[PDB]
Amino acid sequence: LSLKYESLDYDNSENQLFLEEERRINHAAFRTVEIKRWVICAMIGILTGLVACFIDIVVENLAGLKYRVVKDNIDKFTEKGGLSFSLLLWATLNASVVMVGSVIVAFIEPVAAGSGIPQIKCYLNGVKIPHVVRLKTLVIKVCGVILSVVGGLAVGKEGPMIHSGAVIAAGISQGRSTSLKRDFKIFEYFRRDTEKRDFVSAGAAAGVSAAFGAPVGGVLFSLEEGASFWNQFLTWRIFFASMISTFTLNSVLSVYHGNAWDLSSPGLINFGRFDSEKMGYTIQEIPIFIFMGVVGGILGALFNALNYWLTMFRIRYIHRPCLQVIEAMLVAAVTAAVGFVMIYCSRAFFNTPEKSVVNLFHDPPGSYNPMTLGMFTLMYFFLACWTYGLTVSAGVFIPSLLIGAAWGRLFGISLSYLSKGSIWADPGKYALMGAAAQLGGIVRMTLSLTVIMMEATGNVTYGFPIMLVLMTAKIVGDYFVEGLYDMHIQLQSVPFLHWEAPVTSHSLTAREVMSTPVTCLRRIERVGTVVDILSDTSSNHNGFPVVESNPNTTQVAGLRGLILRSQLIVLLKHKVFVERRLKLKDFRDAYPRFPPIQSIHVSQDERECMIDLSEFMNPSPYTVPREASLPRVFKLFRALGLRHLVVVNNHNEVVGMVTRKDLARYR
Amino acid sequence: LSLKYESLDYDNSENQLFLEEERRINHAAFRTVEIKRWVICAMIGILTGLVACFIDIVVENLAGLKYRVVKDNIDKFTEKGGLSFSLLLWATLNASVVMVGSVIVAFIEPVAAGSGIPQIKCYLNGVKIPHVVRLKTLVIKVCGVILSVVGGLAVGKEGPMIHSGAVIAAGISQGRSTSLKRDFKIFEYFRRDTEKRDFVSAGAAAGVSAAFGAPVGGVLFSLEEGASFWNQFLTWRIFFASMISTFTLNSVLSVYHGNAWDLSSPGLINFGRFDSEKMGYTIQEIPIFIFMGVVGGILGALFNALNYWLTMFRIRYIHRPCLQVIEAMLVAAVTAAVGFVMIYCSRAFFNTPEKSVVNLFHDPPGSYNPMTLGMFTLMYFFLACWTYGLTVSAGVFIPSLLIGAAWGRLFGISLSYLSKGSIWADPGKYALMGAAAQLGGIVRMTLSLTVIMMEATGNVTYGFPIMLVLMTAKIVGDYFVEGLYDMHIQLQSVPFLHWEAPVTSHSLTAREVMSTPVTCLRRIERVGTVVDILSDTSSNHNGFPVVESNPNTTQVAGLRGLILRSQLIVLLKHKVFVERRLKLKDFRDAYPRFPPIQSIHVSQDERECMIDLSEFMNPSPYTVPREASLPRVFKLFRALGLRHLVVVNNHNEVVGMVTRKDLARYR
Ligand SMILES: CCCCCCCCC(=O)OC[C@H](COP(=O)(O)O[C@@H]1[C@H](O)[C@H](OP(=O)(O)O)[C@@H](O)[C@H](O)[C@H]1O)OC(=O)CCCCCCCC
Ligand SMILES: CCCCCCCCC(=O)OC[C@H](COP(=O)(O)O[C@@H]1[C@H](O)[C@H](OP(=O)(O)O)[C@@H](O)[C@H](O)[C@H]1O)OC(=O)CCCCCCCC
Ligand SMILES: Nc1ncnc2c1ncn2[C@@H]1O[C@H](COP(=O)(O)OP(=O)(O)OP(=O)(O)O)[C@@H](O)[C@H]1O
Ligand SMILES: Nc1ncnc2c1ncn2[C@@H]1O[C@H](COP(=O)(O)OP(=O)(O)OP(=O)(O)O)[C@@H](O)[C@H]1O
Ligand SMILES: [Cl-]
Ligand SMILES: [Cl-]
Ligand SMILES: [Cl-]
Ligand SMILES: [Cl-]
Ligand SMILES: [Cl-]
Ligand SMILES: [Cl-]
Ligand SMILES: [Mg+2]
Ligand SMILES: [Mg+2]
């Protein structure tokens, strides 16, 4: 959709240098590479769990400090100023914390804004958003989520965990820090995009597991996002990482909050225990659940749609960082004022959202007055909608669950009245169902969310109902608007590939999808020609088919290989011309950041030399016939994580190039 | 490995007829095909659950009848004959039930022998074992498992559920019964191997879910076996089927055993509830668990190895059906005698294995004397080893879990003695760990088994230890011998593709793997030539590349398509010669069973005619370069479920053919 975004080189080039390295590795007499992958996955899990522990502990302590300071100060300030004076003071306190958070996000690292989940979804899809995996981004994300939660915004701390795990996985796998310019001479074999994308999948799964105490759910989330060929080894490693993440979080928290290692804190949010007779559903109740799904599908849409409009306003008028900070402060102040009006009219805004969700799930039937619960539902709905897109590190999972739990507990109260206090009409069960439905409507997650809800709930039997609502919420929701993360991905104009091609696509063939004419390089090519092709500012192609150079062959453009701009740049830098032989490490040294063609200097004498690309080109590029259905091209492209696909004639002559933007256009 | 086994045509041929059908389907103005897939998955789940209910209820009633008959008869027979007389009578009773079961297996349908899991694994791998999915096979399997369990063999009823679900999925999806020669004019679009293999995956997942009450575990089992490109839609449907299977089983059983629908019977085997303080592991205990894994890895090997030798004897000397029935009777009699000696020396053989496993898991610390528990462990180990390969419908999961639980509860008793009755040294927790370790050693299942154990246990926290043991059991076990299901697959000589190619395979290239010379067909081909190629009894190739026929092109064997023996047979039958136009249904009519080439009659005048294969050939065959690494060929072959892969020159001239046996040879 936009050229700002490049793509990962997931499909490794099995060139001659790579095969030489593999021969030496096999001769090594021991395959330590897999053991190193395992050690890296363990470290990823441990570090993600420790990040979750840090956030939880710091948030708890700072929230306690805010509560203590205001509890001490209210007497003094209300004695003379009055209630309104204390209202203003507390609102300014919240605004100040949110101000620091929004400053660090807008003025230092705007990528840190939000949960990070859309960015990680794009990364696992195969698109590289500029600063998603950086040390600065992780630091800003963690600090900002702490400051946002302490600042009393309608936000949650679960979402940033996925992004933090992804960044940790990308970082520690390399063995070196580009930001700190420190190289630890380890894990050099894993300085390639394939291994990095595997480790990031592990890290995202670990983040989900630490967030919700849902290991299998995290594994399934990573599998969904990747949408690749099945690798038993990688899935098992991801499972290992997720398990260690949840284990580390639980153990450390148990040692902290309690004085024993007994495991009672699987995740950052813990729903509770639902193993009771009152929380048992009958077949007669299955239709009822489905209906709530419809509701969650509609309300969710109304959420997303509203945000869309809000987002546009922010793109039009709140583009500036200073205005962004001011808007975040204003939202925080209005949230505080709504809370005060709430609290003084009633006789949860001060309390954590997770505790409110738990109480809604498990409190006895007569706990809540319907009127106040509905007021909270409406106000929190509109506040969460007005908070998602702010330049603050925050998530939307817990807010969505809270909204759903509230209106589900209202539905349960109404059912209990209508059914004369029946055991089957228990408000907490319907609160859980409503939480699932609202989260599904706002975010269209199906398998991973079902498994996550089952694990957090702790019951496997509740999965079948949770499934049916999550189904319906999607089916109804997709009727009106697209999902939140998708919506923001479209707005950012990222080239995003969906699970499958548009249904009416068997009509289309690669001939329509492919791009022509194609810029190709002869196997033995003049240095000047390569320099001119790469130096062109009209286009910034990063993959070039390598065609026959000998005059003997009949083929006009017979496909011999595919080479990349990065490899050509390395070769030109090292002046590897036919007129010290490179090793696969020499290419890995440039990684991740490759010098621009402008940097390389090629003298007119050197411009007349030649480059032989046979030793460095990918000898075997993936190829499709020109008369091939679009679904097949899409399936092959997505499954293998290809960056370039070559469309050829019957005679194996290059006729076109299919890339990510070629397949993303149709929708 | 052997030519007795063909392969599924999972990769659909997007020929002209298929595209015409898709255009008409799109013009239909409503896509009911997906809705029909959903309805079929729901029916699969319901029917699998009902099969599980039938087996459970019938087994319970018949076991009660046996217990009542013997309880009444022992007084009368022991009064005059003595204890030995009653011993003989009861042994003969068990032998008679096992005799009926073994007769129906050996003399009617030998495929029904065993769990069916190896056969379903092969089917999902892509190999077609002759009678795996047949009505007769399902009937025999269910009856035989009932008779084996009622006959007191060291067997379990869980394993046949996977096979039964697979057969149901294959059957009801077609809309017609070949065995009963009845056609219900429904589900005609799904009479192709792709849809059948998807439905069978759903059915296998449903079987696992009904067996262990583990929906997600069943989904993961199916995903592991398929090892294909990720399809969100298919995975979601499989999840739907598994959930409905467990729900139906639980609901029906609750209505039967209780008088209320309250859900308390998720699966055929139910471990129990482990949410207690005594069943809580510490970090200090993590190493201990690992050690037990090693034990489970070693013992499991000793199991498998022994069976191997036994299997050989049975292949050499107990090949005959009558001898097979006699051997099953002898094993049953020896099992009964061991039970009697057991029972009279002590003062579980009469009791169900599942109840014994549950009691071992949950009974209080002082329940079992170590001496008798060890005697049972050893005797049951050797009896289960001597029972797995019998011509009786049976499984090995529950026996393995029982063995592991027994020696794990011995390990826990020893730990309690050594640690002076510590709370951390609780025998039941170690019994669960030992069950997992022994099952892992005997069967090398890693992810699906971990998730299944977590769900059956009901605790997510126990997964991390259960993982570590299951890891170690595999790593140690693979050091000595291969897994049981694998071992039997090798012995049957089925061409089985593993998850990845041998590690030292980058050295090999398609040129080594591919088969030459290749038998190809010109696009316009003489009918006599096709008849001769298909009539050859030297080879039975089922896939033929279609090369250029026009003299104009330079290519000697330019690849234009791929056609199949079945399609050619249909065309010859309908005399579709250039010298009524077929519809995609006409090919589906022959499916599943295609007439042999011998059946078709072609007159000498017709032999001189021509066939144009363009409208029917697969216009776009998957292709790889001759200079391509074996890992890549293997990855593409396994991910896309290909039956044929064409290896071509730089000029796109056919040079070789890679099939399943080509890639399975290297090991
Ligand atoms: C108690 C909390 C635990 C905190 C853990 C923090 C670790 C994760 C982290 O916060 O990051 C680590 C930074 C890397 O950050 P980094 O700024 O250098 O980012 C580059 C680069 O910038 C690319 O960015 P780009 O693609 O945009 O060009 C990007 O892709 C690429 O993945 C990155 O390596 O240090 C390290 O490596 C860690 C040293 C590992 C060696 C010891 C192993 C034992 C564990
Ligand atoms: C309460 C217990 C529930 C019992 C359910 C039993 C249903 C499953 C079953 O036991 O099987 C059904 C048989 C098919 O057995 P079948 O012998 O004809 O086998 C052929 C053939 O033989 C191929 O065998 P092959 O490949 O070796 O040549 C094989 O692949 C291919 O899948 C098979 O269709 O009847 C049916 O279709 C069911 C009618 C469905 C229409 C109503 C839909 C509403 C539910
Ligand atoms: N060698 C080539 N010859 C002609 N067109 C090309 C070539 N490579 C890419 N294109 C086309 O140019 C357009 C822009 O491509 P771009 O330069 O972004 O490729 P890229 O950056 O390598 O792709 P990605 O960033 O997704 O890996 C695409 O629509 C693509 O079809
Ligand atoms: N058209 C062909 N020309 C030459 N050799 C072939 C051809 N097709 C298959 N072979 C080779 O013949 C051997 C036996 O093949 P077979 O006849 O079993 O193929 P098939 O039955 O179509 O394969 P499958 O049963 O696995 O689908 C294989 O090792 C294969 O490489
Ligand atoms: Cl974000
Ligand atoms: Cl959140
Ligand atoms: Cl979020
Ligand atoms: Cl079997
Ligand atoms: Cl079993
Ligand atoms: Cl089994
Ligand atoms: Mg680009
Ligand atoms: Mg064959």
Side-chain angles (χ1 to χ4, degrees), chain A residues 115 117 155-160 212 354 394-399:
Chain A
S115 20
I117 285 153
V155 298
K157 51 170 181 179
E158 306 298 331
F212 317 111
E354 299 92 46
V396 71
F397 256 65
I398 306 314

PDB file of all heavy atoms in Angstrom, chain A residues 115 117 155-160 212 354 394-399, ligand 6:
ATOM      1  N   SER A 115      -0.709  -0.398  21.958  1.00  0.00           N
ATOM      2  CA  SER A 115      -0.351  -1.687  22.538  1.00  0.00           C
ATOM      3  C   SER A 115       0.903  -2.261  21.896  1.00  0.00           C
ATOM      4  O   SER A 115       1.688  -2.947  22.557  1.00  0.00           O
ATOM      5  CB  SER A 115      -1.512  -2.665  22.382  1.00  0.00           C
ATOM      6  OG  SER A 115      -2.391  -2.240  21.356  1.00  0.00           O
ATOM      7  N   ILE A 117       0.418  -4.358  19.407  1.00  0.00           N
ATOM      8  CA  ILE A 117      -0.088  -5.572  18.770  1.00  0.00           C
ATOM      9  C   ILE A 117      -0.232  -5.400  17.268  1.00  0.00           C
ATOM     10  O   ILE A 117       0.137  -6.318  16.527  1.00  0.00           O
ATOM     11  CB  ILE A 117      -1.387  -6.020  19.450  1.00  0.00           C
ATOM     12  CG1 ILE A 117      -1.074  -6.654  20.798  1.00  0.00           C
ATOM     13  CG2 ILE A 117      -2.132  -7.009  18.578  1.00  0.00           C
ATOM     14  CD1 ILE A 117      -2.193  -6.540  21.775  1.00  0.00           C
ATOM     15  N   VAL A 155      -7.225   2.349  30.348  1.00  0.00           N
ATOM     16  CA  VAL A 155      -6.224   1.575  29.633  1.00  0.00           C
ATOM     17  C   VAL A 155      -5.889   0.317  30.418  1.00  0.00           C
ATOM     18  O   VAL A 155      -6.239   0.171  31.592  1.00  0.00           O
ATOM     19  CB  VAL A 155      -4.944   2.397  29.379  1.00  0.00           C
ATOM     20  CG1 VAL A 155      -5.262   3.597  28.517  1.00  0.00           C
ATOM     21  CG2 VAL A 155      -4.327   2.833  30.690  1.00  0.00           C
ATOM     22  N   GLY A 156      -5.201  -0.604  29.743  1.00  0.00           N
ATOM     23  CA  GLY A 156      -4.725  -1.811  30.373  1.00  0.00           C
ATOM     24  C   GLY A 156      -3.254  -2.027  30.080  1.00  0.00           C
ATOM     25  O   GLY A 156      -2.696  -1.488  29.124  1.00  0.00           O
ATOM     26  N   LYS A 157      -2.629  -2.836  30.932  1.00  0.00           N
ATOM     27  CA  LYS A 157      -1.203  -3.119  30.835  1.00  0.00           C
ATOM     28  C   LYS A 157      -0.891  -4.425  30.114  1.00  0.00           C
ATOM     29  O   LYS A 157       0.286  -4.782  30.000  1.00  0.00           O
ATOM     30  CB  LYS A 157      -0.581  -3.150  32.240  1.00  0.00           C
ATOM     31  CG  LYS A 157      -1.306  -4.049  33.225  1.00  0.00           C
ATOM     32  CD  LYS A 157      -0.523  -4.220  34.510  1.00  0.00           C
ATOM     33  CE  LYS A 157      -1.251  -5.137  35.475  1.00  0.00           C
ATOM     34  NZ  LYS A 157      -0.495  -5.348  36.738  1.00  0.00           N
ATOM     35  N   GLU A 158      -1.906  -5.142  29.629  1.00  0.00           N
ATOM     36  CA  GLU A 158      -1.663  -6.446  29.016  1.00  0.00           C
ATOM     37  C   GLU A 158      -1.053  -6.314  27.626  1.00  0.00           C
ATOM     38  O   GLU A 158      -0.115  -7.042  27.285  1.00  0.00           O
ATOM     39  CB  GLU A 158      -2.965  -7.239  28.947  1.00  0.00           C
ATOM     40  CG  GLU A 158      -3.676  -7.379  30.276  1.00  0.00           C
ATOM     41  CD  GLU A 158      -2.854  -8.123  31.303  1.00  0.00           C
ATOM     42  OE1 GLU A 158      -2.033  -8.973  30.903  1.00  0.00           O
ATOM     43  OE2 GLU A 158      -3.021  -7.854  32.511  1.00  0.00           O
ATOM     44  N   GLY A 159      -1.575  -5.394  26.804  1.00  0.00           N
ATOM     45  CA  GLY A 159      -1.180  -5.295  25.419  1.00  0.00           C
ATOM     46  C   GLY A 159       0.289  -5.043  25.178  1.00  0.00           C
ATOM     47  O   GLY A 159       0.888  -5.699  24.319  1.00  0.00           O
ATOM     48  N   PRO A 160       0.920  -4.114  25.899  1.00  0.00           N
ATOM     49  CA  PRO A 160       2.350  -3.855  25.666  1.00  0.00           C
ATOM     50  C   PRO A 160       3.242  -5.056  25.914  1.00  0.00           C
ATOM     51  O   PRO A 160       4.394  -5.054  25.464  1.00  0.00           O
ATOM     52  CB  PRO A 160       2.652  -2.720  26.653  1.00  0.00           C
ATOM     53  CG  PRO A 160       1.357  -1.997  26.756  1.00  0.00           C
ATOM     54  CD  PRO A 160       0.319  -3.079  26.748  1.00  0.00           C
ATOM     55  N   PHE A 212      -1.921 -13.100  30.128  1.00  0.00           N
ATOM     56  CA  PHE A 212      -3.163 -13.764  30.511  1.00  0.00           C
ATOM     57  C   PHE A 212      -2.945 -15.119  31.172  1.00  0.00           C
ATOM     58  O   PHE A 212      -3.924 -15.800  31.493  1.00  0.00           O
ATOM     59  CB  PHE A 212      -4.069 -13.937  29.290  1.00  0.00           C
ATOM     60  CG  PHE A 212      -4.131 -12.731  28.411  1.00  0.00           C
ATOM     61  CD1 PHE A 212      -3.562 -12.751  27.154  1.00  0.00           C
ATOM     62  CD2 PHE A 212      -4.754 -11.576  28.840  1.00  0.00           C
ATOM     63  CE1 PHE A 212      -3.612 -11.646  26.343  1.00  0.00           C
ATOM     64  CE2 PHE A 212      -4.811 -10.467  28.030  1.00  0.00           C
ATOM     65  CZ  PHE A 212      -4.236 -10.506  26.779  1.00  0.00           C
ATOM     66  N   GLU A 354      -8.825  -4.492  36.251  1.00  0.00           N
ATOM     67  CA  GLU A 354      -8.833  -5.944  36.381  1.00  0.00           C
ATOM     68  C   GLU A 354      -9.614  -6.386  37.613  1.00  0.00           C
ATOM     69  O   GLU A 354     -10.371  -7.363  37.563  1.00  0.00           O
ATOM     70  CB  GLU A 354      -7.401  -6.467  36.441  1.00  0.00           C
ATOM     71  CG  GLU A 354      -6.579  -6.157  35.202  1.00  0.00           C
ATOM     72  CD  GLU A 354      -5.805  -4.860  35.323  1.00  0.00           C
ATOM     73  OE1 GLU A 354      -5.168  -4.640  36.375  1.00  0.00           O
ATOM     74  OE2 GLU A 354      -5.833  -4.057  34.368  1.00  0.00           O
ATOM     75  N   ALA A 394      -0.718   1.966  25.793  1.00  0.00           N
ATOM     76  CA  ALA A 394      -1.922   1.439  26.414  1.00  0.00           C
ATOM     77  C   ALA A 394      -2.463   0.291  25.580  1.00  0.00           C
ATOM     78  O   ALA A 394      -2.079   0.101  24.423  1.00  0.00           O
ATOM     79  CB  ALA A 394      -2.980   2.532  26.568  1.00  0.00           C
ATOM     80  N   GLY A 395      -3.371  -0.471  26.187  1.00  0.00           N
ATOM     81  CA  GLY A 395      -4.045  -1.548  25.501  1.00  0.00           C
ATOM     82  C   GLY A 395      -5.549  -1.410  25.634  1.00  0.00           C
ATOM     83  O   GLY A 395      -6.057  -0.615  26.423  1.00  0.00           O
ATOM     84  N   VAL A 396      -6.259  -2.208  24.835  1.00  0.00           N
ATOM     85  CA  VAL A 396      -7.715  -2.153  24.759  1.00  0.00           C
ATOM     86  C   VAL A 396      -8.367  -3.453  25.194  1.00  0.00           C
ATOM     87  O   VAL A 396      -9.603  -3.538  25.207  1.00  0.00           O
ATOM     88  CB  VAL A 396      -8.175  -1.765  23.340  1.00  0.00           C
ATOM     89  CG1 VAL A 396      -7.926  -2.897  22.355  1.00  0.00           C
ATOM     90  CG2 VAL A 396      -9.631  -1.339  23.335  1.00  0.00           C
ATOM     91  N   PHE A 397      -7.585  -4.466  25.561  1.00  0.00           N
ATOM     92  CA  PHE A 397      -8.167  -5.741  25.972  1.00  0.00           C
ATOM     93  C   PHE A 397      -8.979  -5.595  27.253  1.00  0.00           C
ATOM     94  O   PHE A 397     -10.172  -5.921  27.280  1.00  0.00           O
ATOM     95  CB  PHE A 397      -7.063  -6.782  26.158  1.00  0.00           C
ATOM     96  CG  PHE A 397      -6.964  -7.781  25.038  1.00  0.00           C
ATOM     97  CD1 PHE A 397      -6.611  -7.366  23.769  1.00  0.00           C
ATOM     98  CD2 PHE A 397      -7.230  -9.122  25.243  1.00  0.00           C
ATOM     99  CE1 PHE A 397      -6.512  -8.266  22.731  1.00  0.00           C
ATOM    100  CE2 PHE A 397      -7.127 -10.024  24.211  1.00  0.00           C
ATOM    101  CZ  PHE A 397      -6.773  -9.596  22.954  1.00  0.00           C
ATOM    102  N   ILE A 398      -8.349  -5.132  28.324  1.00  0.00           N
ATOM    103  CA  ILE A 398      -8.999  -5.046  29.629  1.00  0.00           C
ATOM    104  C   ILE A 398     -10.176  -4.076  29.580  1.00  0.00           C
ATOM    105  O   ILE A 398     -11.223  -4.366  30.171  1.00  0.00           O
ATOM    106  CB  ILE A 398      -7.993  -4.657  30.723  1.00  0.00           C
ATOM    107  CG1 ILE A 398      -6.801  -5.615  30.714  1.00  0.00           C
ATOM    108  CG2 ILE A 398      -8.653  -4.680  32.081  1.00  0.00           C
ATOM    109  CD1 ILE A 398      -7.183  -7.072  30.622  1.00  0.00           C
ATOM    110  N   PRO A 399     -10.049  -2.908  28.944  1.00  0.00           N
ATOM    111  CA  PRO A 399     -11.236  -2.047  28.800  1.00  0.00           C
ATOM    112  C   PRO A 399     -12.403  -2.739  28.118  1.00  0.00           C
ATOM    113  O   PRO A 399     -13.554  -2.614  28.563  1.00  0.00           O
ATOM    114  CB  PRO A 399     -10.702  -0.879  27.963  1.00  0.00           C
ATOM    115  CG  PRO A 399      -9.273  -0.806  28.310  1.00  0.00           C
ATOM    116  CD  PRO A 399      -8.820  -2.215  28.525  1.00  0.00           C
TER     117      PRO A 399
HETATM  118 CL    CL C   6      -4.768  -4.400  27.691  1.00  0.00          CL
END
